[PDB]
Amino acid sequence: TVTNEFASRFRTIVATLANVVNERAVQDDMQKATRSCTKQWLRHLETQFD
Amino acid sequence: LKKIAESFEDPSSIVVVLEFILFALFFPTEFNRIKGDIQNVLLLFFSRWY
């Protein structure tokens, strides 16, 4: 398979955590920079995971 | 095609897409010769971004 289901599941998981950490980030009025940095680390974990 | 190990994790990865478009302008012929192999990369781009 071109796509790996075990990895795609981790993909959706990470999208969910992105929404969650996003809401917590905006609730605590933290800087845009750190917020996008969290998202970047998350998508990196996504890649490593595949 | 010479191998291109792009993950397309970051927007900067658009560079690789440009690299192809340019290659398809200057060299439509070789492009048409290897475009399937290019498509393998473009699908990694498209599955992430869209």
The coordinates were experimentally obtained by cryo-EM
- Any residues with CB less than 8 A from the CB of A7 and at least 6 apart, and which? A49, A50
Extended strands (E) in B1-50 = none
Kindly determine whether residue B7 and residue A47, on different chains, have CB atoms separated by under 8 Å. Answer: yes
Size of interface A-B (CB pairs under 8 A): 9
Q: Which of residues 6-45 of B touch A (CB under 8 A)?
A: 7, 9-10, 43
Experimental resolution (Å)? 3.0
Helix axes A32-49, A5-27, angle to 10 degrees: 170
Please check whether residue B45 is in contact with residue B13, taking contact to mean a CB–CB distance below 8 angstroms. Answer: yes
Among B9, B12, B42, B49, pick the best mutation site for testing chain A contact (most A Cβ within 10 A): B9
